[PDB]
Amino acid sequence: SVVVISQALPVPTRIPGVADLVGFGNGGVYIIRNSLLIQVVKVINNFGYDAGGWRVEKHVRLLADTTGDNQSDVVGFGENGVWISTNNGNNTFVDPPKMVLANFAYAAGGWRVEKHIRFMADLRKTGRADIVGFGDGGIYISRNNGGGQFAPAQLALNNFGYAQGWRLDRHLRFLADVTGDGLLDVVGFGENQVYIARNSGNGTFQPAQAVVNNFCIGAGGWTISAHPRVVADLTGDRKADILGFGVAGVYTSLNNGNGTFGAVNLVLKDFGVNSGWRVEKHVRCVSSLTNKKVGDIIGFGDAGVYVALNNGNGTFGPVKRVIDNFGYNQGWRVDKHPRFVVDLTGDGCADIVGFGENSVWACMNKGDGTFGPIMKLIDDMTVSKGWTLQKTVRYAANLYL
Numbered sequence: 068s069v070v071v072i073s074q075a076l077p078v079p080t081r082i083p084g085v086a087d088l089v090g091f092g093n094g095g096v097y098i099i100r101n102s103l104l105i106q107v108v109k110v111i112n113n114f115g116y117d118a119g120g121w122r123v124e125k126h127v128r129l130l131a132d133t134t135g136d137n138q139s140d141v142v143g144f145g146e147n148g149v150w151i152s153t154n155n156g157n158n159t160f161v162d163p164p165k166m167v168l169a170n171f172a173y174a175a176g177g178w179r180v181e182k183h184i185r186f187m188a189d190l191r192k193t194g195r196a197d198i199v200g201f202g203d204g205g206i207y208i209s210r211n212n213g214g215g216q217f218a219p220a221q222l223a224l225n226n227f228g229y230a231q232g233w234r235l236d237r238h239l240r241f242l243a244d245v246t247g248d249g250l251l252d253v254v255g256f257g258e259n260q261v262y263i264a265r266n267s268g269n270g271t272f273q274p275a276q277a278v279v280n281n282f283c284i285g286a287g288g289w290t291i292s293a294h295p296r297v298v299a300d301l302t303g304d305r306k307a308d309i310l311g312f313g314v315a316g317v318y319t320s321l322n323n324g325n326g327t328f329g330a331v332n333l334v335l336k337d338f339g340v341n342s343g344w345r346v347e348k349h350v351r352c353v354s355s356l357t358n359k360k361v362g363d364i365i366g367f368g369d370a371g372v373y374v375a376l377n378n379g380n381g382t383f384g385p386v387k388r389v390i391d392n393f394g395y396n397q398g399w400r401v402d403k404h405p406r407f408v409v410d411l412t413g414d415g416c417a418d419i420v421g422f423g424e425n426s427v428w429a430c431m432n433k434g435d436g437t438f439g440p441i442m443k444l445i446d447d448m449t450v451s452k453g454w455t456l457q458k459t460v461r462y463a464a465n466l467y468l
């Protein structure tokens with residue numbers, strides 16, 4: 068499906084695609100290129116816990132194409148500014164990184180991981196990722212003007228900021244195209260309403276408008292600790308819908324096609340609190356698993372991975388356990404073992420990857436939402452090889468096409 072940026076998954080992956088694995092480890096940045104040779108390559112002696120002083124609680128580390136050549140660069144929101152290591156095209160990156168803007172940082176603009184959100188996104192159809200932050204006064208953007216030149220930060224909209232009452236412990240903020248013009252709009256699950264703000268394509272967003280009185284902490288009792296929510300295309304028209312894992316199960320509100328939204332319906336009595344799903348034990352994702360290229364539901368539960376396939380119209384088929392692994396009963400832990408649903412094979416049907424206690428493992432989609440056997444990738448980038456979730460960042464990312 069289509070480009071959505073969320074707090075949980077700030078580095079989108081392509082469908083179809085052959086995603087790479089990237090690790091910000093103790094010693095710097097390491098990649099596992101998706102290829103016939105599976106190996107770890109150290110590419111930058113920076114952006115690491117010891118190699119550079121990078122901290123999850125102070126800094127943000129992402130991958131984004133900042134030049135327009137469809138190669139992803141490493142972008143870090145560091146201590147005193149934004150630092151970028153560009154992709155050299157050959158599984159190497161520039162080192163040291165370049166400081167492109169003294170803003171959006173812990174000691175340049177007072178940015179705080181616990182109050183603010185920092186993304187990279189092509190907001191103006193230039194082919195290059197601009198810097199986008201949900202800061203104190205609103206949403207701020209720094210335009211990527213090319214050749215590493217980022218312009219001084221401009222206020223894009225005086226909303227969705229900490230000053231307006233937006234809180235990471237209560238609310239959710241996304242970027243997603245809800246209108247179909249290819250521009251990423253803001254979607255914010257506020258106190259009482261889901262709000263959208265249309266991207267005008269010029270570095271600003273239009274005034275926020277409420278679309279749904281549900282999916283929020285004050286409207287339906289949706290909490291961060293218990294009820295995950297996503298935005299995703301559930302019908303194939305490339306416009307994002309709203310999906311939440313609530314108490315009884317999965318609730319949706321479908322986009323009418325113009326950024327207006329339908330009623331909230333319970334579409335599947337599974338994957339919710341009443342079926343025993345718990346944010347601290349389980350992982351719940353929406354990704355395309357089939358040739359319909361719509362959002363299907365994937366849950367890493369107790370006994371393994373469970374999937375319900377979208378019929379193509381936002382209704383769902385039966386829940387099936389597709390692999391007896393990657394689950395809580397197999398020792399997988401949200402606090403220790405990152406798990407992703409991403410295309411690793413290029414067929415457009417997302418696959419599973421997880422960074423286990425000892426090894427990285429994958430399980431490949433057969434093409435129809437059913438899965439093959441578990442496969443070992445490599446014995447690195449794991450707990451026992453010195454990667455603790457709290458001192459490292461790991462992503463699936465398309466470094467190259």
Ligand SMILES: [Ca+2]
Nearest residue numbers: 244245246250
């Ligand atoms: Ca749009």
Ligand SMILES: [Ca+2]
Nearest residue numbers: 411412416418
């Ligand atoms: Ca695949």
Ligand SMILES: [Cl-]
Nearest residue numbers: 145146147148
């Ligand atoms: Cl710095």
